[PDB]
Design a protein around this ligand. Structure first.
Ligand SMILES: Nc1ncnc2c1ncn2[C@@H]1O[C@H](COP(=O)(O)OP(=O)(O)NP(=O)(O)O)[C@@H](O)[C@H]1O
Ligand SMILES: Nc1ncnc2c1ncn2[C@@H]1O[C@H](COP(=O)(O)OP(=O)(O)NP(=O)(O)O)[C@@H](O)[C@H]1O
Ligand SMILES: O=C(NC[C@H](O)CO)c1ccncc1Nc1ccc(I)cc1F
Ligand SMILES: [Mg+2]
Ligand SMILES: [Mg+2]
Lengths: 274, 310
């Protein structure tokens, strides 16, 4: 009930890359793990206790579509140890390797994603950073979602307060999240919005706003409700019941978006009618 | 150009010829110069020619087709040869990162100089404005490309008193790739770009003004300084962008700076792009005519500020 890895236990190896809130190295620790060196290297004791409290809840998560959260360390610097995944992320497949899946397997990717998300929300866990970068395709089969939760090692702390400096990639952020002016922006429906964008990735093979090449323009227009994913770009072979679902997740007003229990049901229903 | 500039321009082309194909093994890493939200820059030695250059490394996760197009589009930089544009030696790809190799500027970016200096003097910001205007001009005429990213961190300076531009949008595919970056903390984007698209050189000129005010006061000027923070002479990214669009433009304090300088920045920061001054106007504005006449020692002021020898 005090999950803390000491020093000399983790064989830190090759540098892999950095993201919204840390840099990732391939380590060893009773097998290959993922060592994410958080960007809050000097954490305040009020911050540090809330991080411990959150790791406690992430440690009690076990689901076929969730990446195993193993614990943390603080000896060299504050870090995170999670299951290492072979094979590329869904972002790699769709936008780098340009893998050619069939609509069956595309829909299957959507289903297991909604499966794991439903488990996370069932345990009252807001992902806060759902994107195709955080969805790995383990052995070209099962979907595994990582980088979930961790609200406390995102956004610097003052001394006892915390205010999410909007960080992450802006393409998956719900408009209410963009604006950051609604007390608690990150919600179950903000994840649903993110999941909507991932649907857009699956169904169009493109990222959203393909014609816009100004980061701050997206931020402003999406936040003001002026910009919305051009659903015209959906492939011709894509199911109608699929396009409709995508659109219900992307509603500008978060209260109109469905929750995952209903979202997951729709995907299984249209998986049959195929 | 005059004589001291034609000398230095032709002197660069000579050292550039001693450089052939750029490989990753030909470089020895000296020190890191800086980093941003999408790049890191090292001072490096090119072993085949002993030259010292700056090497920007961009790690992008893009498909190879797009990546190869970016390298191709960057090779236009072998044609930009002005005393107001940073030198370009080559660009290539290797070990999963794009390298842009450019000439070293031992003063660094004006963003760095501003931290060391606190505030920058109007007599110095005069000479800086001259160069940024002349650099935007050379880009607008001889190449019909627009910067699209004017800010203090992209204006470079050196011990020979030069003031050069860099990081100007020559490769659109790179720009579009960098669009899927994480949010920054602050913006220099004109209010029309935040709402639509580039409006010719005018939307760069806004950026120049917002940089001038930041450098002149020592603080990013959105939102404008408090009533008593100013006599002492954190907003969300979206709110700043809403501020830039739907609130009056920032200005300089009325007492501290000349009226020519206050007008210069005000003409630059007009929210309507068309009413906003263009290069032809600024080039013959009062503040520029005066600041071009003054014989300021920029090299000396730079080396004193950093702490270097004369
Ligand atoms: N558990 C993991 N196993 C293997 N590779 C990983 C793992 N987590 C992250 N990576 C890789 O590490 C690199 C950077 O990851 P990461 O820091 O999580 O960036 P990101 O996922 O792109 N954005 P974000 O997850 O929100 O911070 C990417 O190439 C990932 O695919
Ligand atoms: N040729 C150069 N000579 C010296 N310093 C340089 C050179 N090019 C870049 N730098 C420095 O490198 C730093 C970071 O590189 P850069 O990629 O331009 O990030 P940035 O402009 O500061 N912010 P961003 O554009 O948001 O990533 C700059 O602040 C400069 O100090
Ligand atoms: O670098 C660019 N954009 C920001 C990037 O993130 C680096 O900070 C960038 C985008 C498009 N075309 C060219 C770019 N570079 C660049 C251009 C001219 C010179 I001389 C030197 C340079 F490096
Ligand atoms: Mg990730
Ligand atoms: Mg730059």
């Amino acid at each position: 009930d005090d999950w803390e890895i000491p020093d000399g236990q983790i064989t830190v190896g090759q540098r892999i890359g950095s993201g919204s809130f840390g840099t990732v190295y391939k380590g060893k620790w009773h097998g290959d793990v993922a060592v994410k060196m958080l960007n809050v290297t000097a954490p305040t004791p009020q911050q540090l206790q809330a991080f411990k409290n959150e790791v406690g809840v992430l440690r009690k998560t076990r689901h076929v579509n969730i990446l195993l959260f193993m614990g943390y360390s603080t000896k060299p610097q504050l870090a995170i140890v999670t299951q290492w995944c072979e094979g590329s992320s869904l972002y790699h497949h769709l936008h780098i390797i340009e893998t050619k899946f069939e609509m069956i397997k595309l829909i299957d990717i959507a289903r297991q994603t909604a499966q794991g998300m439903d488990y996370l929300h069932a345990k009252s866990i807001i992902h806060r950073d759902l994107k195709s970068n955080n969805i790995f395709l383990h052995e070209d089969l099962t979907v595994k979602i990582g980088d979930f939760g961790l609200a406390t090692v995102k956004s610097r702390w003052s001394g006892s307060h915390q205010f999410e400096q909007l960080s992450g990639s802006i393409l998956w952020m719900a408009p209410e999240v963009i604006r950051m002016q609604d007390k608690n922006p990150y919600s179950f429906q903000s994840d649903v919005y993110a999941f909507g964008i991932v649907l857009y990735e699956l169904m169009t093979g493109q990222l959203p706003y393909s014609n816009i090449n100004n980061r701050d323009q997206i931020i402003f227009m999406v936040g003001r409700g002026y910009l919305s994913p051009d659903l015209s770009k959906v492939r011709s072979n894509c199911p109608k019941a699929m396009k409709r679902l995508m659109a219900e997740c992307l509603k500008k007003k978060r209260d109109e978006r469905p929750l995952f229990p209903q979202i997951l049901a729709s995907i299984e229903l249209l998986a049959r009618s195929l | 150009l005059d004589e001291q500039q034609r000398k230095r321009l032709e002197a660069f082309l000579t050292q550039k010829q001693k450089v052939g194909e750029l490989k990753d093994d030909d470089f020895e890493k000296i020190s890191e110069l800086g980093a941003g939200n999408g790049g890191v820059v090292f001072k490096v030695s090119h072993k085949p020619s002993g030259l010292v250059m700056a090497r920007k490394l961009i790690h992008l996760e893009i498909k190879p087709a797009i990546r190869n197009q970016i390298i191709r589009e960057l090779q236009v930089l072998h044609e930009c040869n002005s005393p107001y544009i940073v030198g370009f030696y080559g660009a290539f790809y290797s070990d999963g990162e794009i390298s842009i190799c450019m000439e070293h500027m031992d003063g660094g970016s004006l963003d760095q100089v501003l931290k060391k200096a606190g505030r920058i003097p109007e007599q110095i910001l005069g000479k800086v404005s001259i160069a940024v205007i002349k650099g935007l001009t050379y880009l607008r005429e001889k190449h019909k490309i627009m910067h699209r990213d004017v800010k203090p961190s992209n204006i470079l300076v050196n011990s020979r008193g030069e003031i050069k531009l860099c990081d100007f949008g020559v490769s659109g595919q790179l720009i579009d790739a960098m669009a899927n970056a994480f949010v920054g903390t602050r913006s220099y984007m004109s209010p029309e770009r935040l709402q639509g698209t580039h409006y010719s050189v005018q939307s760069d000129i806004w950026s120049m003004g917002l940089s001038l005010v930041e450098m002149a006061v020592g603080r990013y000027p959105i939102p404008p300084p408090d009533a008593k923070e100013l006599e002492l002479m954190p907003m969300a990214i979206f709110e700043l962008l809403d501020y830039i669009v739907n609130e009056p433009p920032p200005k300089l304090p009325s007492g501290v700076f000349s009226l020519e300088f206050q007008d210069f920045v005000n003409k630059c920061l007009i929210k309507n792009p068309a009413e906003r001054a263009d290069l032809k106007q600024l080039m013959v504005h009062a503040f520029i005519k005066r600041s071009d006449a003054e014989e300021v020692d920029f090299a000396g002021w730079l080396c004193s500020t950093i702490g270097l020898n004369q």
